[PDB]
């Protein structure tokens, strides 16, 4: 474990009240949006001081909150933990609401394709193991449809569409453990059709542990772990390169732009006095290999 990373850190969230934090965008002003289990946040891109809050109480809420930038729109969610229900809006960049909608059940991940169909992961229900990857069109965001099932002992975790026709999605086995297999597959929209799958459980080049969540990169995607690793691939899950390394156990989402990542980050580290703290911070990274442990020496 690190120290806490005040000279590093883009913006400390935990004062803004933006605790354990999932996901972060840019929106089409450039400026950066939080999900987390604090609210929803937006901050100004260049001073980074609080514009609009979604405050919620994050001892009482669910993992994976999502927040999508589409066109000049925001897309988020929230969820109580013990309710199971999800709350998704549509808002101005300003915080008007002009959609909110309620999701039976709690989610791990979103994406969106650039002509507007929007899917998500469903955790698995209780007493069930296998989950779901449903779709619906931003125009009319209800009434999900299935697009795959997972296969019994396996789980869908994260996915991101590659272009209007492709999905890649992560899985890990379920109940998931550290020494868990996973791989990545490929499906096809216009027909729901699994194309591909790549990869596998490791901490070796080419290999998965656990992503945290894929970004579409060019033609292709890069995706983050819980080794800290980025790893880049091609549109049909070649590996390509680790493009960058952090500290293992503080990442979750991330978004990218001008070749550099901008980290969602949340996790134990020590503080001034060497004491072990819960912190939660914004920090960027380039994608040209850089890492944390270089950067020590």
């Given at each position: 474990?690190?120290?806490?990373?005040?000279?590093?850190?883009?913006?400390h969230?935990?004062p803004?009240?933006?605790?354990?934090?999932?996901?972060?965008?840019?929106?089409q002003?450039?400026?950066?949006?939080?999900?987390?289990?604090?609210?929803?946040y937006?901050?100004?891109?260049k001073?980074?001081?609080?514009?609009?809050?979604?405050?919620?109480?994050?001892k009482?809420?669910?993992?994976?909150?999502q927040?999508?930038?589409?066109?000049?729109?925001i897309?988020?969610?929230?969820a109580?933990?013990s309710?199971?229900?999800?709350?998704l809006?549509?808002?101005?960049?300003?915080?008007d609401?002009?959609?909110?909608?309620?999701?039976?059940?709690?989610?791990?991940?979103?994406?969106?394709t650039?002509?507007?169909?929007?899917?998500?992961?469903?955790?698995?229900?209780?007493?069930?193991?296998?989950?779901?990857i449903?779709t619906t069109?931003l125009?009319?965001?209800?009434?999900?449809?299935?697009?795959?099932?997972?296969?019994?002992?396996?789980a869908?975790?994260?996915?991101?569409?590659?272009?209007?026709?492709?999905?890649?999605?992560s899985?890990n086995?379920?109940?998931?453990?550290?020494?868990?297999?996973q791989?990545?597959v490929?499906?096809?929209?216009?027909t729901?059709?699994?194309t591909?799958?790549?990869?596998?459980?490791?901490?070796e080049?080419?290999?998965?542990?656990?992503?945290?969540?894929?970004?579409?990169?060019?033609?292709?995607?890069?995706?983050n772990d819980?080794?800290?690793?980025?790893?880049?691939?091609?549109?049909?899950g070649?590996?390509?390169?680790?493009?960058?390394?952090?500290?293992a156990?503080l990442?979750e989402?991330?978004?990218?732009?001008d070749?550099?990542?901008?980290?969602?980050?949340?996790?134990?580290?020590?503080?001034?006095?060497?004491?072990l703290?819960?912190?939660?911070?914004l920090?960027?990274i380039?994608?040209?290999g850089s890492?944390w442990?270089?950067?020590?020496?």
């Amino acid at each position: 474990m690190g120290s806490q990373r005040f000279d590093e850190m883009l913006l400390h969230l935990e004062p803004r009240g933006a605790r354990v934090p999932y996901n972060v965008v840019y929106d089409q002003d450039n400026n950066i949006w939080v999900a987390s289990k604090g609210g929803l946040y937006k901050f100004n891109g260049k001073t980074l001081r609080t514009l609009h809050e979604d405050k919620k109480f994050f001892k009482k809420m669910a993992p994976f909150p999502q927040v999508i930038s589409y066109k000049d729109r925001i897309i988020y969610t929230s969820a109580e933990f013990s309710d199971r229900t999800t709350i998704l809006r549509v808002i101005s960049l300003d915080g008007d609401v002009v959609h909110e909608s309620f999701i039976e059940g709690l989610l791990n991940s979103m994406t969106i394709t650039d002509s507007g169909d929007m899917y998500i992961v469903k955790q698995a229900e209780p007493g069930h193991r296998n989950n779901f990857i449903m779709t619906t069109h931003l125009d009319t965001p209800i009434g999900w449809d299935v697009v795959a099932e997972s296969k019994p002992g396996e789980a869908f975790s994260r996915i991101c569409a590659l272009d209007d026709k492709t999905l890649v999605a992560s899985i890990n086995d379920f109940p998931m453990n550290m020494f868990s297999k996973q791989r990545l597959v490929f499906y096809d929209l216009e027909t729901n059709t699994e194309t591909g799958s790549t990869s596998k459980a490791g901490k070796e080049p080419g290999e998965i542990f656990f992503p945290r969540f894929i970004k579409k990169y060019g033609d292709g995607f890069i995706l983050n772990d819980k080794s800290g690793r980025f790893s880049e691939f091609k549109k049909n899950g070649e590996f390509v390169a680790i493009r960058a390394r952090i500290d293992a156990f503080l990442g979750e989402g991330f978004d990218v732009k001008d070749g550099e990542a901008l980290m969602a980050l949340t996790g134990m580290v020590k503080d001034p006095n060497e004491q072990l703290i819960c912190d939660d911070w914004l920090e960027t990274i380039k994608l040209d290999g850089s890492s944390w442990k270089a950067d020590r020496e």
